[PDB]
Design a protein around this nucleic acid. Structure first.
Length: 209
DNA sequence: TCCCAGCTCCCTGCTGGCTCCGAGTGGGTTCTGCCGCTCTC
């Protein structure tokens, strides 16, 4: 229904705000907690043949340390995102001169488009996200523990302390849902803190490789 | 210059093939080619 799809847009915007906050970017508190009525007042009440048309939902955020990181998110119109739409989005990325973006696909993009995302990867970072994936925050589940992204100096200090190579660490795939949530890439180490039945707290390090 | 119809290419779904199947132990049995045809005494 129209009310259901309005709820869907509000919830997915809340998940985008939580993801951008967890990735280290700057979001406002009221942007973090928007109600359904407040979202409807801000963007429109009936999106079908109405005001919120999935184009005005793009978000400008910047990193806390660097105000020129300038990450956007995009909500494509068509359910099947293709090379034409991705080329339009990347050309737009070129004139506003930003490097990183998120694409929130309705159902799925074409294999040629998802390959073009890999081909465009060095200069511009493009990530595919389904609307079904972002309908809930997976980091709030009781099974999922806390994930902390480590800096390069911290990783170097860790490997010097334990006298380890990068191969000897446990691994996590780049296609992992938490890895895609944090936007981690190959070669980085994620730090997992979980409660322990026997010791109380246990810390595990995993290499994204 | 540009709009279609036709060819190209990657993913998805399905079918056929291959490997595996508890640890020890004590007895017993049958079977270890055979018909033949040239060859040798």
């Amino acid at each position: 229904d129209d009310e259901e799809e309005t709820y869907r847009l509000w919830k997915i915007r809340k998940t985008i705000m939580q993801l951008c906050h967890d990735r280290g970017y700057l979001v406002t508190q009221d942007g973090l907690d928007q109600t359904l009525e407040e979202f409807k007042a801000q963007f429109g009440g009936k999106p079908s043949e109405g005001r919120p048309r999935r184009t005005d939902l793009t978000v400008l955020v910047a990193h806390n340390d660097d105000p020129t990181d300038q990450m956007f998110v995009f909500f494509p119109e068509e359910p099947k995102v293709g090379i034409k739409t991705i080329k339009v989005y990347c050309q737009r990325m070129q004139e506003e001169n930003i490097t990183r973006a998120l694409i929130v696909v309705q159902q799925g993009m074409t294999p040629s488009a998802k390959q073009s995302l890999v081909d465009m990867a060095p200069k511009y970072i493009l990530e595919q996200f389904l609307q079904q994936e972002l309908l809930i925050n997976i980091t709030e589940h009781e099974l999922v523990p806390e994930h902390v992204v480590m800096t390069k100096e911290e990783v170097t200090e860790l490997l010097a302390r334990y006298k380890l190579r990068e191969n000897q660490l446990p691994r996590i795939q780049a296609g992992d849902p938490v890895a895609r949530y944090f936007g981690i890439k190959r070669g980085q180490v994620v730090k997992i803190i979980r409660p322990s039945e026997t010791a109380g707290r246990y810390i595990t390090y995993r290499l994204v490789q």
